């Protein structure tokens, strides 16, 4: 699926059991995107930082948002897609401005991103904050590295996992 809205960017959306959208961003960036899980009205399901590379260093945010937890917000707006498109444009414009730039993906490029994430295995880590820049170091043709943020309570709690080849 796709939209162009009363906003500023074209935004690709996928849906299967809830809505999915992704933003690319271009060393370390700020970690504080946990606050954007709780925008002014919408409540997103998760913020997942995604990254893949060797070369081919790519870094992504993929966002999950349940409309049925967000009906009070959607009902004010002319579309559920327009709702999440706006909320992702908010995150994109918040990230954009520094050395790293950000934009919503087109759904075609979302399928491209899915292909590059596949390209064709160790434990999930309990303590993670220091690990990220060294967990890239083990020798592989492809690494996929990702971090998950979820609203366990009024805070946000973190999990991370990885696979190689």
């Amino acid at each position: 699926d796709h939209q162009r809205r009363f906003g500023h960017d074209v935004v690709g959306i996928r849906e299967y059991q809830g809505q999915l959208v992704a933003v690319v961003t271009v060393w370390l960036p700020v970690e504080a995107v946990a606050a954007r899980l709780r925008q002014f009205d919408v409540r997103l399901d998760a913020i997942d930082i995604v990254s893949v590379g060797t070369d081919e260093h790519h870094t992504w945010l993929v966002l999950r948002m349940d409309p049925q937890r967000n009906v009070a917000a959607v009902a004010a707006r002319d579309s559920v897609a327009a709702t999440l498109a706006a909320a992702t444009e908010r995150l994109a414009h918040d990230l954009n401005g520094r050395r790293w730039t950000a934009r919503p993906l087109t759904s075609s490029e979302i399928d491209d991103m899915d292909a590059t994430v596949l390209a064709g295995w160790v434990s999930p880590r309990d303590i993670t904050s220091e690990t990220l820049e060294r967990l890239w170091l083990p020798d592989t043709e492809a690494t996929a590295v990702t971090v998950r943020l979820r609203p366990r309570h009024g805070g946000v709690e973190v999990s991370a996992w990885v696979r190689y080849h």
Partner: protein, 462 residues
């Protein structure tokens, strides 16, 4: 200094801003208006205007205006809040005065209260004929319980078919208004005499075959009215829950010769399992493509409004409303089943009597889990209500037939002290605040209530 990021909304637009959180609102409203007007003019949207006389104000989204002399902070605006910008129309005008007492009474009452109206009158008539036909059907059921006469079943059948045809004609002809709830009331009212008419055709003495037949046919009709109407579905969800349990008991008493205690413990087990499964089942039942009739909240949004565009909004809203209604009906039905099984188990004049009181306490805690966990006001209140009613039902089941001052004093004491504790947990406890760890520990305790039921279910089964 602290500055709060907030959303603001006006002129069918929402904008996000960062406001100087400790400056008075009167310092900031004027350039905020200028900012909004610039942004709207940039968007090609007609800017805000003052109409006549009045003043510009900011409100919370619930509607209450902010004191202009106060800052955001001390009127509890926080980061991530929403504020609604308005021009409040001038409130002042001459005060009227009616010097004659009788005319002043008549005009104030007529102005301030609502008279009877034929719209209300038809609903009242429908309610009273519903009450009448349930009394008639329950009365025929009482007579067939007391006497072996075959003749009540034709009366129940004929009154059922008359009211059902009347309901169908009203629903077909007069579907044009939200007063089709008259037809819904009549249909709800008339499925019951049909159920007792089918049940009374079972020969011999009344009992389990009559019960299983009547509850089965009533639940089947309540399931059909989902697909054919799809209106007022919470009450039919509760009814089909009750009929499913009653039919399972009737088949267990006909195919087998199981005792009542075994079946009640089976029913309790099914209840606590269904409580665990109810939200998922509701989210399933949320999408059965039954007819689309908007309920009150959806209607009163769709009056203010015209997988993309507004059709998506309409579908998402209707789907959520169906989900919430199914969930509420389910929880009410389970609540009834839970109290009726706990009441049936706790006979005081039994040797095993100490055990089901433990089952009661475990279920009581387990229900309070869901009550604190589930979001809808009337679902939390449902869960709390049924939890209390467990205690009340078992207490009376003891103290009524156990003629002793001991059990009397015990029951009446817990019956007054326990809800006062239930109140105390929010009345004195500051805004019901506890630490997340303590909350999770309470969730652990009332979860640790659940796995004792499994062996106790085995032990009361045998």
């Amino acid at each position: 200094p602290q500055a709060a990021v907030v959303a603001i909304m006006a002129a069918d637009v929402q904008i996000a801003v960062v406001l100087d959180a400790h400056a008075p609102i009167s310092v900031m409203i004027d350039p905020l208006l200028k900012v909004v007007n610039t942004r709207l003019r940039e968007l090609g949207v007609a800017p805000l205007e003052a109409k006549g006389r009045g003043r510009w104000m900011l409100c919370l989204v619930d509607g209450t205006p902010l004191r202009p002399n106060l800052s955001l902070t001390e009127q509890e605006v926080y980061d991530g809040d929403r504020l609604w910008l308005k021009f409040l129309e001038d409130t002042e005008h001459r005060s009227e005065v009616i010097e004659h007492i009788s005319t002043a009474v008549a005009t104030n009452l007529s102005k301030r209260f609502a008279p009877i109206d034929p719209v209300v009158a038809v609903q009242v008539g429908a309610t009273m004929v519903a009450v009448g036909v349930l009394l008639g059907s329950a009365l025929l059921g009482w007579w067939r319980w007391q006497h072996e006469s075959w003749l009540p079943a034709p009366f129940a059948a004929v009154i059922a078919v008359l009211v059902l045809t009347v309901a169908t004609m009203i629903l077909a002809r007069s579907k044009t208004v939200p007063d089709r709830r008259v037809g819904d009331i009549l249909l709800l009212s008339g499925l019951v005499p049909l159920a007792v008419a089918i049940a009374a055709t079972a020969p011999g003495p009344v009992g389990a075959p009559h019960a299983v037949l009547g509850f089965g046919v009533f639940g089947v009709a309540a399931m059909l009215v989902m697909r054919f109407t799809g209106r007022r579905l919470g009450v039919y969800t509760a009814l089909v829950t009750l009929c499913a349990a009653a039919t399972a008991a009737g088949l267990a008493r006909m195919v087998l010769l199981t005792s009542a205690v075994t079946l009640l413990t089976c029913v309790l087990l099914a209840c606590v399992l269904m409580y665990h499964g109810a939200p998922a089942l509701s989210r399933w039942l949320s999408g059965i493509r039954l007819p689309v009739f908007p309920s009150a909240t959806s209607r009163w949004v769709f009056e203010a409004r015209p997988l993309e565009g507004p059709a998506s909004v309409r579908d998402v809203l209707l789907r959520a409303e169906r989900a919430r209604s199914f969930l509420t009906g389910l929880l009410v039905g389970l609540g009834v089943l839970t109290v009726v099984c706990l009441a049936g188990l706790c006979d005081p004049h039994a040797g095993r009597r100490w055990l089901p009181l433990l089952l009661a306490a475990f279920t009581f805690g387990f229900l309070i889990l869901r009550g604190r966990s589930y979001v809808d006001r009337w679902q939390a209140i449902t869960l709390a209500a049924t939890a209390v009613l467990i205690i009340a039902a078992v207490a009376v089941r003891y103290v009524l037939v156990s003629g002793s001052p001991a059990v009397l004093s015990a029951g009446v004491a817990v019956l007054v002290l326990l809800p006062a504790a239930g109140l105390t947990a929010a009345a004195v406890v500051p805004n019901t605040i506890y630490s997340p760890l303590f909350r999770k520990i309470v969730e652990w305790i009332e979860y640790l209530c659940l796995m004792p039921i499994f062996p106790l279910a085995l032990w009361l089964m045998n």
